[PDB]
Design a protein around this ligand. Structure first.
Ligand SMILES: *[C@@H]1O[C@H](CO)[C@@H](O[C@@H]2O[C@H](CO)[C@@H](O)[C@H](O)[C@H]2NC(C)=O)[C@H](O)[C@H]1NC(C)=O
Ligand SMILES: *[C@@H]1O[C@H](CO)[C@@H](O[C@@H]2O[C@H](CO)[C@@H](O)[C@H](O)[C@H]2NC(C)=O)[C@H](O)[C@H]1NC(C)=O
Ligand code: NMN
Ligand code: NMN
Lengths: 250, 250
């Protein structure tokens, strides 16, 4: 297996994050049984590390699903850490990692051992080793649910300094989220193309892969919009480059 | 009891945070037993809610204690959430909430019932109800240790928009941290007096209570410096006021 091995103390982390997230839910949706949510999740750990399907996590989703506030959904590609810091524990936006079912697994890794019943802490299959691995199937199911329950203004953060372009045509965003957006519940889609401070400007709005994305969205009938270096996020990037010209204050 | 009751699922949260913090420790001190640390914590917990002293957490500290990087300590008053966001989970600085023994209790609340042996989820005493309550004794003990283990350049974030002044002469910093700083391993102390965007300039470096802080540190023999609205933190504050003139970019 060519991917990271199972996260140590997976269960405690999972249960801990689930318990803390509950406090964020409103009393009306605060009724979530974390132990049951974990039991539904661990079903993938009883299977062959190459035989886990997205549907296997259906129960898990049913037990953790909760609504997402309108205009608060934030999708992304190649900017995991920046999205989490910007979203700031749901205060600014609510990306998948800030939704219950995404929160419990964010950055974690897991899979059962090939021939044994125990968890494999050595490594886990990548999409290259096999398509139906536990992690990939998990995110496909979770991202599908996140897209379906999103509404209002849809925000997307992309990396304009990524060597392969801002929009990867084969990513989760392209294959599992865009196709599941409910047009009737969406006002418009707003893209944020962020560049590293001083970093390379590989692609900006309307260039390269960004043209492919815009064309797909408009063809699908969505009202579209793109912003290079959305100021609020730029300010956050600047926290680490305060003495750089890009970050000088008036 | 005037303070909020013990946090729900206190144990799951505690162990969850503990498990996650380990990954952040260098292999050298990563040898931590979260369950044992929890048991040490309970020792102070299973006592009369108005009879818990700082020393009751000695064991807890011993099992969770670890070194703090030179020049990475960050003390503060009246800016808890801003300090946590700036510190960014130990990436920039390591405030008390980003040290193992502080991380597991951050924002939480706890106390045993006045009579029965169960935790009191209804309420917990404040300093007013009784001085020796579980939470205040915990933070006194933790502050003392954090302070004794800090070295190099000491940083302090103060809120210059606080009505009563930037430096509380009766807060944890003045009463439990400054007295426990080891001058032998400290090079200098640097203060950052932060003001709310647009917010009031109640006090700035060299004014009011700040004059008290400076004189106390200098009387103790420390090299001292103060900075108004330290740029990196100012930028972070700006993320939420991108269109305010204080936040306009060059
Ligand atoms: C946006 O993409 C850039 C380019 O891939 C990322 O920066 C690279 O990060 C890797 C790993 O941290 C380094 O090995 C490279 O040296 C970096 N390259 C450059 C040009 O900076 C950057 O981390 C991405 N931004 C976000 C928020 O994920
Ligand atoms: C710095 O102190 C100020 C003053 O106490 C804090 O601002 C107040 O925050 C409360 C609670 O959110 C508001 O109801 C008041 O309207 C604010 N007053 C003013 C004058 O702004 C501020 O939150 C503190 N800063 C930090 C980072 O904690
Ligand atoms: N840890 C996560 O939060 C996580 C992981 C994989 C996919 N996703 C979803 O897929 C999209 C792209 O993420 P990838 O980096 O996996 O391509 C995002 O918009 C997100 O909602 C989120
Ligand atoms: N949750 C916390 O991180 C926490 C709580 C109480 C005291 N403290 C320590 O005491 C000092 C003053 O802050 P407080 O006003 O919260 O007591 C800080 O420098 C800090 O290190 C930290």
């Amino acid at each position: 297996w060519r991917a990271e091995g199972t996260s140590a103390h997976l269960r405690d982390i999972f249960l801990g994050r689930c318990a803390e997230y509950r406090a964020l839910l409103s009393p009306e949706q605060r009724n979530k049984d974390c132990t049951a949510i974990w039991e539904a999740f661990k079903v993938a750990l009883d299977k062959d590390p190459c035989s886990v399907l997205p549907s296997d996590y259906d129960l898990f989703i049913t037990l953790s699903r909760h609504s997402i506030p309108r205009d608060k959904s934030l999708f992304w590609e190649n900017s995991h850490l920046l999205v989490n810091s910007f979203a700031d524990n749901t205060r600014r936006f609510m990306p998948l990692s800030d939704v219950l079912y995404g929160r419990v697994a964010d950055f974690l890794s897991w899979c059962r051992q090939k021939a044994d019943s125990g968890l494999d802490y050595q490594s886990c299959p990548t999409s290259e080793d096999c398509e139906n691995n536990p992690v990939d199937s998990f995110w496909k199911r979770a991202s599908i649910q996140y897209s379906k329950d999103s509404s209002g203004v849809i925000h997307v953060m992309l990396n304009g300094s990524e060597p392969t372009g801002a929009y990867p045509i084969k990513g989760f965003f392209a294959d599992y989220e865009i196709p599941n957006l409910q047009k009737e519940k969406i006002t418009r889609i707003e893209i944020w193309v962020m560049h590293e401070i001083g970093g390379p400007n590989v692609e900006s709005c309307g260039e390269g892969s960004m043209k492919v994305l815009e064309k797909r969205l408009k063809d699908m009938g969505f009202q579209y919009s793109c912003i290079n270096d959305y100021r609020p996020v730029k300010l956050l990037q600047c926290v680490d480059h305060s003495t750089h010209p890009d970050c000088a204050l008036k």
